[PDB]
Design an enzyme around this catalytic site. Structure first.
Site, PDB file in Angstrom:
ATOM      1  N   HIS A  61       0.432  -0.720   0.120  1.00 47.37           N
ATOM      2  CA  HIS A  61      -0.070  -0.788  -0.247  1.00 47.37           C
ATOM      3  C   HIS A  61       0.995   0.961  -0.025  1.00 47.37           C
ATOM      4  O   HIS A  61       2.302   1.321   0.600  1.00 47.37           O
ATOM      5  CB  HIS A  61      -1.068  -0.315   1.321  1.00 47.37           C
ATOM      6  CG  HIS A  61      -1.979   1.004   1.340  1.00 47.37           C
ATOM      7  ND1 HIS A  61      -1.673   2.012   1.288  1.00 47.37           N
ATOM      8  CD2 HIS A  61      -3.427   1.065   0.732  1.00 47.37           C
ATOM      9  CE1 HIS A  61      -3.024   2.789   0.720  1.00 47.37           C
ATOM     10  NE2 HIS A  61      -3.918   2.403   0.934  1.00 47.37           N
ATOM     11  N   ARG A  65      -3.066   1.531  -4.128  1.00 49.14           N
ATOM     12  CA  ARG A  65      -2.681   0.316  -3.809  1.00 49.14           C
ATOM     13  C   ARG A  65      -2.590   0.056  -5.839  1.00 49.14           C
ATOM     14  O   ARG A  65      -3.719   0.085  -5.944  1.00 49.14           O
ATOM     15  CB  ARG A  65      -2.606  -0.632  -3.295  1.00 49.14           C
ATOM     16  CG  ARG A  65      -4.950  -0.874  -3.164  1.00 49.14           C
ATOM     17  CD  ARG A  65      -4.798  -1.795  -1.693  1.00 49.14           C
ATOM     18  NE  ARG A  65      -5.623  -1.250  -0.950  1.00 49.14           N
ATOM     19  CZ  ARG A  65      -6.749  -1.953  -0.316  1.00 49.14           C
ATOM     20  NH1 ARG A  65      -6.483  -2.986  -0.282  1.00 49.14           N
ATOM     21  NH2 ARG A  65      -7.968  -1.559   0.259  1.00 49.14           N
ATOM     22  N   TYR A 115      -3.296  10.839  -2.295  1.00 49.15           N
ATOM     23  CA  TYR A 115      -1.691   9.335  -2.215  1.00 49.15           C
ATOM     24  C   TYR A 115      -0.983  10.540  -3.154  1.00 49.15           C
ATOM     25  O   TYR A 115       0.466   9.856  -3.629  1.00 49.15           O
ATOM     26  CB  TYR A 115      -1.781   8.388  -2.624  1.00 49.15           C
ATOM     27  CG  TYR A 115      -2.833   7.724  -2.799  1.00 49.15           C
ATOM     28  CD1 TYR A 115      -3.982   7.001  -3.533  1.00 49.15           C
ATOM     29  CD2 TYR A 115      -3.028   7.506  -1.018  1.00 49.15           C
ATOM     30  CE1 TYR A 115      -4.857   6.170  -2.269  1.00 49.15           C
ATOM     31  CE2 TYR A 115      -3.763   7.029  -0.183  1.00 49.15           C
ATOM     32  CZ  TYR A 115      -4.439   5.916  -0.806  1.00 49.15           C
ATOM     33  OH  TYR A 115      -5.138   4.772  -0.660  1.00 49.15           O
ATOM     34  N   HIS A 136      -7.315  15.919   3.520  1.00 46.37           N
ATOM     35  CA  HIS A 136      -7.406  15.528   2.112  1.00 46.37           C
ATOM     36  C   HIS A 136      -6.437  16.142   1.162  1.00 46.37           C
ATOM     37  O   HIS A 136      -5.932  17.081   0.225  1.00 46.37           O
ATOM     38  CB  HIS A 136      -7.893  15.195   1.011  1.00 46.37           C
ATOM     39  CG  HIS A 136      -8.771  13.871   0.719  1.00 46.37           C
ATOM     40  ND1 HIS A 136      -9.780  12.701   1.635  1.00 46.37           N
ATOM     41  CD2 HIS A 136      -7.851  12.429   0.057  1.00 46.37           C
ATOM     42  CE1 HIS A 136      -9.672  11.397   1.611  1.00 46.37           C
ATOM     43  NE2 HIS A 136      -8.655  11.644   0.686  1.00 46.37           N
TER      44      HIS A 136
HETATM   45  C1  LIG Z   1      -9.626   8.294   8.895  1.00 48.91           C
HETATM   46  C2  LIG Z   1      -8.729   8.050   8.152  1.00 48.91           C
HETATM   47  C3  LIG Z   1      -7.106   8.764   9.466  1.00 48.91           C
HETATM   48  C4  LIG Z   1      -7.332   8.979  11.046  1.00 48.91           C
HETATM   49  C5  LIG Z   1      -7.050   9.544  11.893  1.00 48.91           C
HETATM   50  C6  LIG Z   1      -5.651   9.694  11.437  1.00 48.91           C
HETATM   51  C7  LIG Z   1      -5.061   9.689  10.274  1.00 48.91           C
HETATM   52  C8  LIG Z   1      -3.896  10.099  10.127  1.00 48.91           C
HETATM   53  C9  LIG Z   1      -3.103   9.033   8.897  1.00 48.91           C
HETATM   54  C10 LIG Z   1      -4.005   8.934   7.636  1.00 48.91           C
HETATM   55  C11 LIG Z   1      -5.255   8.789   8.085  1.00 48.91           C
HETATM   56  C12 LIG Z   1      -6.120   9.471   8.869  1.00 48.91           C
HETATM   57  C13 LIG Z   1      -7.740   6.629   7.807  1.00 48.91           C
HETATM   58  O1  LIG Z   1      -8.242   6.054   8.997  1.00 48.91           O
HETATM   59  N1  LIG Z   1      -7.602   6.861   6.921  1.00 48.91           N
HETATM   60  C14 LIG Z   1      -7.344   5.498   5.654  1.00 48.91           C
HETATM   61  C15 LIG Z   1      -8.522   4.681   4.892  1.00 48.91           C
HETATM   62  C16 LIG Z   1      -9.582   5.820   4.082  1.00 48.91           C
HETATM   63  N2  LIG Z   1      -8.753   6.259   2.808  1.00 48.91           N
HETATM   64  C17 LIG Z   1      -7.473   5.832   2.730  1.00 48.91           C
HETATM   65  C18 LIG Z   1      -6.817   6.426   1.820  1.00 48.91           C
HETATM   66  N3  LIG Z   1      -7.820   7.504   1.869  1.00 48.91           N
HETATM   67  C19 LIG Z   1      -9.050   7.079   2.458  1.00 48.91           C
HETATM   68  C20 LIG Z   1      -7.876   8.272   6.067  1.00 48.91           C
HETATM   69  O2  LIG Z   1      -7.581   7.906   5.038  1.00 48.91           O
HETATM   70  N4  LIG Z   1      -8.081   8.943   7.448  1.00 48.91           N
HETATM   71  C21 LIG Z   1      -8.117   9.971   6.698  1.00 48.91           C
HETATM   72  C22 LIG Z   1      -9.328  10.911   6.735  1.00 48.91           C
HETATM   73  C23 LIG Z   1     -10.914  10.416   6.153  1.00 48.91           C
HETATM   74  C24 LIG Z   1     -11.619  11.291   5.523  1.00 48.91           C
HETATM   75  C25 LIG Z   1     -11.348  12.868   6.490  1.00 48.91           C
HETATM   76  C26 LIG Z   1     -10.785  13.666   6.858  1.00 48.91           C
HETATM   77  C27 LIG Z   1     -10.638  14.637   8.101  1.00 48.91           C
HETATM   78  N5  LIG Z   1     -10.671  15.798   7.482  1.00 48.91           N
HETATM   79  C28 LIG Z   1      -9.552  12.089   7.421  1.00 48.91           C
HETATM   80  C1  LIG Z   2       1.915   8.234   9.228  1.00 45.33           C
HETATM   81  C2  LIG Z   2       0.414   7.615   8.872  1.00 45.33           C
HETATM   82  C3  LIG Z   2      -0.274   7.117  10.286  1.00 45.33           C
HETATM   83  C4  LIG Z   2       0.065   7.402   7.440  1.00 45.33           C
HETATM   84  C5  LIG Z   2      -0.987   6.424   7.214  1.00 45.33           C
HETATM   85  C6  LIG Z   2      -1.199   5.939   5.518  1.00 45.33           C
HETATM   86  C7  LIG Z   2      -2.851   5.740   5.079  1.00 45.33           C
HETATM   87  C8  LIG Z   2      -2.440   6.773   3.385  1.00 45.33           C
HETATM   88  C9  LIG Z   2      -3.227   4.762   5.480  1.00 45.33           C
HETATM   89  C10 LIG Z   2      -3.910   3.243   4.899  1.00 45.33           C
HETATM   90  C11 LIG Z   2      -3.583   2.462   5.298  1.00 45.33           C
HETATM   91  C12 LIG Z   2      -5.259   1.675   4.779  1.00 45.33           C
HETATM   92  C13 LIG Z   2      -6.063   1.075   6.363  1.00 45.33           C
HETATM   93  C14 LIG Z   2      -5.710   1.157   3.779  1.00 45.33           C
HETATM   94  C15 LIG Z   2      -7.094   1.342   2.676  1.00 45.33           C
HETATM   95  O1  LIG Z   2      -7.619   2.175   2.003  1.00 45.33           O
HETATM   96  P1  LIG Z   2      -8.579   2.199   1.630  1.00 45.33           P
HETATM   97  O2  LIG Z   2      -8.611   1.139   1.273  1.00 45.33           O
HETATM   98  O3  LIG Z   2      -9.097   2.923   1.697  1.00 45.33           O
HETATM   99  O4  LIG Z   2      -8.479   2.361   0.026  1.00 45.33           O
HETATM  100  P2  LIG Z   2      -7.799   2.579  -0.724  1.00 45.33           P
HETATM  101  O5  LIG Z   2      -8.092   1.381  -1.766  1.00 45.33           O
HETATM  102  O6  LIG Z   2      -7.718   3.873  -2.411  1.00 45.33           O
HETATM  103  O7  LIG Z   2      -6.993   2.914  -0.296  1.00 45.33           O
HETATM  104 ZN   LIG Z   3      -7.918   9.821   0.383  1.00 40.59          ZN
END
Ligand SMILES: C[C@@]1(c2cccc3ccccc23)C(=O)N(CCCn2ccnc2)C(=O)N1Cc1cccc(C#N)c1
Ligand SMILES: CC(C)=CCC/C(C)=C/CC/C(C)=C/COP(=O)(O)OP(=O)(O)O
Ligand SMILES: [Zn+2]
Lengths: 395, 314
Positions: A222, A265, A274, A336
């Site tokens: 990922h 991914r 990303y 984002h």
């Molecule tokens: C919810 C969370 C997330 C929660 C806590 C700390 C994090 C630290 C780093 C990256 C994600 C983090 C999390 O677990 N994921 C990962 C799963 C969903 N995802 C993967 C790629 N784009 C979205 C987030 O993307 N977050 C961010 C998020 C989604 C929707 C709204 C807001 C706002 N404002 C923030």
């Molecule tokens: C430092 C720190 C805490 C960094 C986090 C970096 C990061 C972007 C992590 C995501 C991990 C995760 C559970 C992805 C699945 O996302 P999905 O299934 O929602 O979406 P996708 O298929 O496009 O990955």
């Molecule tokens: Zn995202």
């Protein structure tokens, strides 16, 4: 057409499902369709700063009950916003700054580290956010909040026998933690000789047949975890512990030929966040490959289409009301916003010793402030911060 | 006691049995930052949690209050942690808990804490009998859910459950061969079973992979698998392949095959092969076809590759 995204030949990058259908091709085709129109429509690009500024400015102080889900991630909310204020080069008032220091202090645990919000248990993710938000502020008041002793004592309570750390006490394990611990251990100058014992080697078991890195050994590669590990290795200086060539072939493969942006991914959907997590990996490799003496490295560009990413962020990721997003049709959010803007900054600025060549699509106002690929905070915020703590003990 | 969405739901302050306990407000300081305007139903439950916690009232009622706090924000590890504290202390039916988490993970599959909780439960009970079946149901709604696949890999490795995972993979690849998470599960199983050292196994896999590529030439995941299972051991170590591809060039030459080609030469210019120069040109020529006509998005990558193929070869 001076835009890579809007020419006629570019319209050839649309998905080739070889006449076979799966839930994957269908979805890939649905994003491409929506991306088509956005592209279409346009036929100079501008970064809606003002519009973004208001969004950011408001957020920093108050949020709707929509953010009840990120209640245990408030220091994140600070970092994401402050950093977007940093990139957009917008000064932080001394009252705003102090109130931030005051807030992050009520989140700091008596055991070290920080919590999602006041009174919450310490967790590595929010701890990273605070130490990062504190440094963006940049004052002495900021820095002095970190109980440098307690931190190190906390990292030590999470460290496992295999070199891996826990996210928090009684929590799970994954490359994200090592990065959090590494980023805070380095900025605050608190790395003891045996702190990351067998860490570099653990992060390494996380790279797989794909070339990238998964959360834990065995998992799919990922883009969010990969950044977490390579950057952690850059800090520990063990970048060499990974097959960087396969990592490079992989990360570069992650950029979408049509959309312009990156997926998290292989065979999934493009996302604006990303733009950092993945594209930010290139500056990192470029560095390690330079530290190895690689003579074939470009001297003005990052090993990825910098214009295409920018074009994806500028045409498809901005919200009218302000803020940037995942992809068209998704609702704006500060995370984002932070990583879309962080991505853009990397897409515009190139480094490598004296070699500095900047690409800036659209108008000149769109140019953003640089960001340190390892911490995602101002390059200067880093120098300034480590300096200050270097002038400090360690034990 | 009464679910957060039930019509007759009543705030915690308006509740009898909760009168002896004072609600603890959140300490956000004089002039807050990123202060969420919590809804009333929200602020209520947590103001009461900040209480039973601030006391450490390891009571049965605070155990019920945890479900509601977790509902309003499943991502609150503080709450989840206290739920495990009470779980132990009050000796609750770990078998009834599995039932809970199953419903939570069903309603909030993309959450970290829901899954970690389920693990701790399987651990405690030392019983994985429902695992595979459950993860397959979540995966049935989202074949790529990361949290799912990760929990699935844990089960198997922890309780030696390799026996049917491969067949599972095959079924899912049938449904969607573009599922990169299942190609990863495939590599996972094998690697921890027969390994790819066994020629019969490695053999079967390449044919299968190839057949998938033939069946859907533009599905990158399959190419990646072929590469992953051959790359580290040496592409140059398998001559036939090099040809069996440059024989589909007319009818198939997507940027994926051209790209694989370059992959193969690079391993030859490594183990040293005859016509070290004829190859170099076959590779550079290809890097430019990619960096100029079939993989323009990766031009800065291919430009470097070419440059490196010389630099270090010569
Ligand atoms: C919810 C969370 C997330 C929660 C806590 C700390 C994090 C630290 C780093 C990256 C994600 C983090 C999390 O677990 N994921 C990962 C799963 C969903 N995802 C993967 C790629 N784009 C979205 C987030 O993307 N977050 C961010 C998020 C989604 C929707 C709204 C807001 C706002 N404002 C923030
Ligand atoms: C430092 C720190 C805490 C960094 C986090 C970096 C990061 C972007 C992590 C995501 C991990 C995760 C559970 C992805 C699945 O996302 P999905 O299934 O929602 O979406 P996708 O298929 O496009 O990955
Ligand atoms: Zn995202």
């Amino acid at each position: 057409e001076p835009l890579y995204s809007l020419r006629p030949e570019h319209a050839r990058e649309r998905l080739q499902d070889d006449s076979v259908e799966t839930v994957t091709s269908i979805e890939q085709a649905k994003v491409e369709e929506k991306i088509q129109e956005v592209f279409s429509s346009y036929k100079r690009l501008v970064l809606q700063r003002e519009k973004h500024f208001h969004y950011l400015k408001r957020g920093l102080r108050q949020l709707t009950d929509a953010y009840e889900c990120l209640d245990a991630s408030r220091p994140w909310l600070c970092y994401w916003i402050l950093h977007s204020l940093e990139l957009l080069d917008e000064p932080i008032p001394q009252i705003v700054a102090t109130d931030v220091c005051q807030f992050l202090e009520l989140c700091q645990s008596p055991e070290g580290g920080f919590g999602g919000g006041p009174g919450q248990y310490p967790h590595l993710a929010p701890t990273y956010a605070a130490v990062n938000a504190l440094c963006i502020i940049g004052t002495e008041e900021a820095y002095d909040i970190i109980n440098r002793e307690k931190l190190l004592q906390y990292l030590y309570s999470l460290k496992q026998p295999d070199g891996s750390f826990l996210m928090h006490v009684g929590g799970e394990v994954d490359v994200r933690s090592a990065y959090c611990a590494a980023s805070v251990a380095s900025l605050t100058n608190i790395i003891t000789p045996d702190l990351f014992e067998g860490t570099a080697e653990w992060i390494a078991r996380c790279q797989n047949w794909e070339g990238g890195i998964g959360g834990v050994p065995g998992m799919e590669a990922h883009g969010g975890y990969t950044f977490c590990g390579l950057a952690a290795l850059v800090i520990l200086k063990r970048e060499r512990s990974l097959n960087l060539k396969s990592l490079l072939q992989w990360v570069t493969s992650r950029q979408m030929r049509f959309e312009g942006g990156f997926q998290g991914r292989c065979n999934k959907l493009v996302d604006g966040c990303y733009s950092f997590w993945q594209a930010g990996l290139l500056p990192l490799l470029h560095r390690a490959l330079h530290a190895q003496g690689d003579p074939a490295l470009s001297m003005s560009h990052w090993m990825f289409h910098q214009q295409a990413l920018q074009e994806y962020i500028l045409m498809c990721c901005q919200c009218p009301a302000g803020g940037l997003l995942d992809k068209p049709g998704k609702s704006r959010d500060f995370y984002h916003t932070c990583y879309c803007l962080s991505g853009l900054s990397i897409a515009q600025h190139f480094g490598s010793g004296a070699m500095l060549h900047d690409v800036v699509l659209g108008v000149p106002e769109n140019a953003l402030q640089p960001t340190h690929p390892v911490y995602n905070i101002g390059p200067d915020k880093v120098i300034q911060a480590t300096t200050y703590f270097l002038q400090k003990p360690v034990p | 006691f009464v679910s957060l969405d039930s019509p007759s739901y009543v705030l915690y302050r308006d509740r009898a049995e909760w009168a002896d306990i004072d609600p603890v407000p959140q300490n956000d300081g004089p002039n807050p930052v990123v202060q969420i305007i919590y809804s009333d139903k929200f602020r209520d439950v947590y103001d009461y949690f900040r209480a039973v916690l601030q006391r450490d009232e390891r009571s049965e009622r605070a155990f019920k209050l945890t479900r509601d706090a977790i509902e309003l924000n499943a991502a609150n590890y503080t709450v989840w942690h206290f739920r495990r504290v009470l779980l132990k202390s009050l000796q609750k039916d770990l078998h009834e808990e599995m039932n809970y988490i199953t419903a939570i993970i069903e309603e909030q599959p993309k959450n970290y804490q829901v899954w970690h909780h389920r693990r701790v439960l399987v651990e405690w009970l030392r019983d994985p009998s429902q695992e595979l079946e459950f993860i397959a149901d979540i995966l049935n709604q989202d074949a790529k859910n990361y949290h799912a696949w990760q929990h699935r890999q844990w089960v198997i490795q922890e309780f030696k459950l390799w026996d049917n995972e491969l067949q599972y993979v095959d079924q899912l690849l049938k449904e969607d061969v573009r599922n990169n998470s299942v190609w990863n599960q495939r590599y996972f199983v094998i690697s921890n079973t027969t390994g790819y050292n066994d020629r019969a196994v490695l053999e079967r896999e390449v044919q299968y992979t190839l057949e998938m590529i033939k069946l859907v030439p533009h599905n990158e995941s399959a190419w990646n698998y072929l590469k992953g299972i051959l790359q580290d051991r040496g592409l140059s170590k398998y001559p036939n392949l090099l040809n069996q591809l440059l024989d589909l060039q007319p009818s198939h030459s997507s940027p994926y095959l051209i790209a694989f080609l370059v992959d193969i030469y690079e391993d030859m210019l490594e183990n040293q092969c005859d016509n070290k120069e004829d190859i170099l040109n076959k590779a550079l020529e290809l890097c430019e076809i990619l960096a100029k006509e079939k993989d323009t998005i990766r031009k800065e990558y291919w430009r470097y590759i070419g440059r490196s193929l010389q630099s270090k070869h010569s």
